[model samples]
Target: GGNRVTVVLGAQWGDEGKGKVVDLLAQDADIVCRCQGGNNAGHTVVVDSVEYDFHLLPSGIINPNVTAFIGNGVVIHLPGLFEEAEKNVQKGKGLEGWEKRLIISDRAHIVFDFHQAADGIQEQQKKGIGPVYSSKAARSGLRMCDLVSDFDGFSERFKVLANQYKSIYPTLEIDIEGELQKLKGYMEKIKPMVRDGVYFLYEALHGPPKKILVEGANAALLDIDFGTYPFVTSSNCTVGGVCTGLGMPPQNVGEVYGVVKAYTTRVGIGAFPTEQDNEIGELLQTRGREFGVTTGRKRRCGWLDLVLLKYAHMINGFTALALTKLDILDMFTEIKVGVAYKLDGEIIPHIPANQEVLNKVEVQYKTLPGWNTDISNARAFKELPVNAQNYVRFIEDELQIPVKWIGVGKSRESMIQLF
Candidate 1:
């Protein structure tokens, strides 16, 4: 009876240039929403040569006409949210009037400074991401509603949580009163933008033929339950996450666009079967500029893994795929795509649950000749070189998903629309 929402998700590991896809879709969007993850997720959008980085806020917020939303599935860091906006606002006209257009779900949990501190400690062993989600599950976490509704009550709970952290990590020190005072200031500034997300989305869905877009942070392989265990992020990054994160029904979901890099890359740690650890890996890393936008860390690079993409497709049911960074492979005379995974001379139908087993599986590669010419100038599907065209077709043939958009370089104009 209402308008359906279009969702854009990362099909591979994180940093698949989802921001560019969101920016393109957001141009005509009425509303854009971020579901799941926190400042841990990084999306970089380059417009008019100005690169704007997004963490907590949806990258689509850059579109002046679109209303940006932060849903209940996301964890909010008060300082991070405001600071991110302020920093971007300083850069360009993209974020102008952002505060007026942005709306946050009151149910979104707050990320305290302590959570980050605890994360630092653990990583000396992790980000406070695991700790904060752990608190949310434990029912000890605070929400935007609590901070904006009742300060005294929020303060009491804050102190209790702070004390609990202090007891567990003896070396950790917290200025409970000081932190609360700063939070109170943020609460007042953010109050006008907070709303009952479920109701707000319900109205948006039923009221008009609005173009709503759900911009998914993180990627399929980073999903907590569906991804590799212990190595995954704390939230669901799959199609199902859109429903749970936004309080929307599954039926309302339309156009699940999965963004995949032409090659594979992963940050931090995990089992990457197709990872190329030689000169090939270095060339991809250097050409692709495969560095973490949030942590400024180097990402492990590899050839495109169709086996992994097929697994992601099984979970996300991606209606279309956006293949990005095709120009990075121009210099290579040959390209390799991982078609299947073989374990002890047998092809496995599923990704193994155990990390040790996943690490031991061998990748079976399909060799394809690279298009030696530059593809960044290609703006249409037919404009691509024959080999490049074949590469896109090969992926479609393997996954049975249409390649709706092909990314050759940065900027909105570089994204070739197939249909």
Candidate 2:
């Protein structure tokens, strides 16, 4: 009945301002853990006018008081971690007590140098870059524990993976010895941050009044099984990811908060049914700063995709919604929202399972009058303009989920809490 554990995930596609919402909720949380994905995921948090772009680390890690955990389901890249840490120190926002506050799951898989090389090179070759992390899906991936237990054995495995990559990409070069030495140096630095994630979380749950906050990288639509096949990330990005990633049970899950943007946006190669592909796309892309935080690639933007949002609810059972980037739509005199989809000239209420159907389907939009007013300073729901109020109400009426948090700006204090 209480908000013991709150799960936050993106509803539409990735880049739903999840980092900001999670940072807001982490104020009341004790432990904040990221469950899935790798450096491929990016979370940006702006504190006191300075922006911190986190790729491998949790967004809440910026908050020294709240402990951050990278769960077992996440794939760790040592070089990336060290690089990010160095950047934070230069920014005068270093995690000085990181040894006590940050914990890496010993069971988590490690992404070797070969993984990144193969990942980047394979994408250029038109070979599907999804499962390039050979050891993970193959169940032979190197775990964090293995790196600490036997460095030489880990190098041998690294060489094996290098040879495997050589077979596929003959021109690719991998220096197993040099790379092993570099990562071993990283191991020395991060030794204090490693822990048994399952036992650590379980003990915390049983002992203290743990306010566990589970943050998911990527969105529900990018889930391996649920998302567009061959176009998704390697791991599951749904609520079920928490159980496997953190070694918890289904009953342990609590309030689920789904983060949806004021409009829809997607990154990389995929089927985007509602893409504007015109002026509106340019407007949203520029206004929202729609670009991939990890890859620095431009994002595909469009109107709010309720069809996808409704499907996300069916998958995660979101208790409430967090609408972000409302201010991005301030300039528009009128706004359009996709309430349904038309497949072969027939109105379809639910999201189709087939990717072909999803790609081919036409989005049916409902035009609403824009507020045409600055809402970034609105402190309460009543403070928002009437037209802005109607926009939120229309979404609530369509999804039947209360809009609990409205994000008008990107700053830490820009959110308006309704509940």
Candidate 3:
């Protein structure tokens, strides 16, 4: 009865190499759960020279031993779910039996194709993620339970929502019968996997000792409540999401591992204080291959912002950190880490809530000597160059959290674990 769910979260912006950390922890995990977000969230996990792209499913699903759970806090698109799985199945054997090992929470809101169409009409990304969340908040969304339980009831409600959309858009045409037919098929396929997530997790927590890993999609800076206004995801991406998303209690939450990139990179628009908009940023972008997995858009690069990490730590209470992609800094003579923010020549104690103030704040950087040597082959903490070792130590000292793992390369063995 000592089941505690371990959580892996992105400490900065999304794409903090959380997939690798989750992959490492999920090897022996009995249950791996995706707590929030939808197909809009992307994770790339590489194993045995084969890369698997996961969206709407937990990256941990690649581990054959792990049972993947999609909790209520997640938004599901039926086609996207199956397509992602089938795509990876074709890519490698990692997801060969994914359907058999996956569980869907009945309460999870469904992302209709029309929602995606609405998103496109609204000048948004075509994923329909935001629109689905909007429908959820409006209490006009359908759930997995609604679809799988009664076809007649689901059909009526679906028509109502569709007609409402048509009324608003005027030109948005929906094939009510055709969509229903598709939903009917999806319902049959997904029905067997649906369960009352709260009770299911409760049983796991009380019935036996099990290793449950909750993978937080997005990052603290992308959290709906805590992130930058109007630019954040529609779900909680912090430790709190583990409970609300999975329907688990806080006491069951265990080790909080914050996966942080050596520097910083964020996709899309936002106020970035440490953003290197010159040649340095360009080099980082090229070296790290900092491109969005879903959108394929170039990510803006910057120095490590401790101020942001500290804020994330305050919210998530990270027990340990997995510092990833340290080898990206191998070419730099000097590396900078943002230590503090100053406004009008005075040190600011907190990050500015206003976007204008945040944009205007001067970032105070603490420069560290770079190793300027390849560290990908360094498989242990002691094997790293003195400067590289110091960089790790410096982060640990600054955050007051142990650096449990340091990632140098894009392989499983490249993650050097320290006690």
Candidate 4:
């Protein structure tokens, strides 16, 4: 069967090993498109003993024939993409002719050096999460199309944006002329890849034999609108992002796939209901190698949060679940799952809207027997330990969503098929 346009995203807080799932799916996919987020989102994939970590570039770039796209909703950082390409090539992963296979949305906003600097300052002052696209929301942001298409006109807008930052950071010194020179150099370098993403994706979808796979950055819980507020990323990280980021309508979407860990892990600041702050947390972290690919920060580990998974499904309408990092749970004798939350002595079946309620609610868990043996080499679902089999069945039964793909190891060939 020809693969329809499938959407892959993280179900939990962020680092859910989505890169491996997307890389595996891209084997049969003709095109792979990244819809949202920017350099902030990191996707790492290991192929043939080589690790390729993608920040701005799509994970599908691993497949040479797969046309990778950075869509309109993304915030582009030119130097970041180039740096990724260079590193991947040096490691022999080979992104040699990337200019031809890659398609960048001209409408996508650019994340300049100023934006990154501002990101840190705001985070420091607020003492929590800060907005990366604040200047863009204020209408003073630069776009990839503006710099590449209108070279002479870009400088004026660039200066205006720089001055806006100057107003925000009164004490800081900014070399406007040098910054302009640096930006222009990078802009000219990436001129070959910038194009109208809307028309490009539409054209590809309309043409047969060109299957497009859409990937979302961050996770559903980090979505600006639906996720835990004041702790979310700057853009949408849900299924609707497919339409907005890639110019695809509701009817065109197919097979919404959500990738989740066997146990949950969250990065950065947020209200995590299932967080384990003890030895169990340390065990999961060390076993899973739970560290941010982008920031290298240690992740807060926890038991599987089905309550959060169900909430994600409610929002993204997931067709199937790609359960990852099961090997990490093999060391434990018992594995617990957060099935629900209790607040004020009342069992809350659904996620509460109020952040205060989220902070105060208590998680209800159901424990399952753990399979202590290594299942990394297991090729089939039945090859797993009996207890592991029971655990997978339990999750499917609870969520009413099939576990189609299971990640047993870190390799691209490490997945076990259940369906």
Candidate 5:
């Protein structure tokens, strides 16, 4: 039987441990392709007692049997990729057999020098404290769209574009095209390994059977269309990203796994309605190690918002759910989850698109009984106490999405498979 493709996506604003889950699934998969995102996303995976943080590459490097593909959906950042690989390899995280398992799509775009320069300069201009997403999406961040028009004279035009923004962004590397050519060489090696990512994955389904895994970067709340505006990621970050990123038909994809944290944690600048200014939020931050994987900045903790989760369910078309960091709630006496929002003194059950409405929205919460005892040693959901079981049951009942699995700890053995 074909090991049908399963996609693991983060339901919140990134850092939901999709990488570890994907790595775990990759052991059974013959091919695992990271269909989207770039170095800005940090997916940490632990394999054979080795912790590996993958940014530009797929976390499937943990399993030698799995072939990993960075499909057309990604924007290549060479410096970030090479640096991450080098740093971890020095830390005894072997890169051996990884190259053989990797492939880069020819259609995948390369992130150039100007993009990084523009990124740094814009953030620098903001003194590193403003709308980072806007700065990146605004007048910066090079994609293949920037270079495709004048392919023959790409070098000259890139210089022209770099000069066009020279006042604000000086010192953009001049040899962008040459660097791209180096990337192109790498693609050639992976080119034979490349097929239309989605279509081929589906084709493999009816042929000799093999397992496939699709991993998404970022989270549903950071999706461009559905998430908080002017604060979300540049692209879509949901289960649907698989079809759009890879050329696969929708049929090959089976379980749509939505990975979310037990308590909410958001990074970057945005409207966080339930921001904790008290002891409990602090506890969530401490207990969960709430910090940004990409920026290393402290994350703002909040109660779970059903309004946001509902929005995620609709947009991502998510079916199954993986609840992570369940052990984080042990530090709290009781845990609260936001069930709805108040807008203009009226209770609303829907997610709002208008930024003003979002800014003015107030949270309406439901407090649940917490398990006073630590469940860090629990390996399965069945092993959890009645209080923890009730929490999962309540979330599934409310969100209209089933909790297919639960993550109790940081290691690979920590995951609890319910179905």
Candidate 6:
């Protein structure tokens, strides 16, 4: 009876090319809005051989019909967003379409100067010599705090840590002083457009019969509640974001389409139970160029992880799955899906919230015959090589969810249809 909107989102740890799919749908959609996440997310959308990496801007910018919005739940990082926009312009791909194309919620919290500095500094300090002091940077990379000298160890570490940062960061390119001023300028520039996004979006639903697409940034596993806690990105990047981030009634949500890669990948440090380090793992990592589009750091690539995938559907009330980058998995002789994890003698069918529990967990995989056939040329589900076909079916069978949308390659045209 209400607007029938299909929310296409990343069902995995993101970087699954939700941007491309959004671009595809945006062509017909009336409005496209990013419900959450900040510059920390890097969504890559390629069109006509041109690649646009959107940070703060919505991937929906490609379509003239869809008005892109930066929902209130987002933390504004102007420089990162601006830098990305410049790149798109240089490529002759964007910003011109941004005339009345973008909006930011006024209630959205600004990413203050202190937040960035604190994020970088605290991370460095935690990864320094003495780490994990009384649950700072929970589940840190290093922790040798069992043996400490001096009663002022904690106080001194916090006080005299500036020198430690300089030592740790020998090579850094952040113009901290200049960036502070730039953020203020951007806030003012986008001020008028920044309204009560929640109210605005809610009103849009009532104005007319509209088909709006609400997009999420990352997987439900990366959610603050279910993710590797401190290791996860800020903001709730799940289907549920429509209510919290966009200010919509939860029941107002309609169809949920979650995007996932053929193989699993993580952007930053976190627990990955599906990780495979042998020939197959390295092959996907290399061929897929599974690197961070935001930080340019190499990603942690592994086989498809149903352990996280199932968790995604369960947590987000996902209706269907969009299998992206299926061609990326074509390189392997066969593909593997982690169905469960065994940690400390306990079999975890669902992804555990505790990082240590997840870290110590051993993956239980379901091996499927690989489709040595290349799907880069395939344009539809039936056109997919036998192996690719089986791969999709195997995922559906295991997850008990249908594989609806498929990403053949990086191009928007690579999205082959079945029915």
Q: Distance from true position, residue 201, model 6, in Å?
A: 1.1
Report, for every candidate in turn, its global Cα lDDT versus the true structure.
0.89, 0.83, 0.89, 0.82, 0.72, 0.68
Clash statistics: count for each candidate: 1, 1, 0, 0, 4, 1
Candidate 1 residues 1-419, lDDT tens each? 68899999998888898888887899899999988888876667777878788888888877788899999998988888889888888888878788899999999999999998888887775337888889999999999999988788999999999999989988877778888889978988999999999999999999968999998988999889888778988999999989989999988998999999999998878899999989999999999998865567889999999998999999999999999999999998999999989999899988988878999999999999988999889988889999999999999999999999999998678889999
What does candidate 6's lDDT look like per residue over 134-216, in tens digits?
11334211111211213245233332343343355555334444643454465455555656676778777877888788777
- Give a tens-digit lDDT track for model 5, residues 1-419: 45567888888887777765785787788877777666676666655667677777777766767777777667776556667777767757466756666765645555655566666766555111122233334544343433443445655554555566564456544455566676555444444444444455556677887777777888888877777887976666776667777766677678888898888888877877777857878888888898865567788888877778777888777778899889888766788998889998899878778766787898989999888888988977778999999999998999888998788888778888888
User: By lDDT, who's the top model here?
Assistant: 1
In model 2, the clashing pairs are 135-141
User: Could you tell me how far off, in angstroms, the CA of residue 182 lies in candidate 3 after the best superposition?
Assistant: 0.3
| Candidate 4 least-lDDT 10 residues | 123-132
| Cα lDDT tens digits for candidate 2, 81-144 | 8887777666666566666788999998887777777777877771122544457878767789
The lDDT, on a scale of 0 to 1, for candidate 4 is 0.82
Runs in model 2 deviating more than 4 A are 1-3, 48-50, 126-133, 292-297
lDDT for model 6 comes to 0.68
The sequence of per-residue lDDT tens digits that candidate 4 reaches over residues 109-144 is 887766666666765662111344666678778888
- Give the root-mean-square deviation of each candidate in angstroms: 1.5, 2.4, 1.6, 2.5, 4.1, 8.9
Q: Estimate each model's TM-score.
A: 0.96, 0.93, 0.96, 0.94, 0.86, 0.80
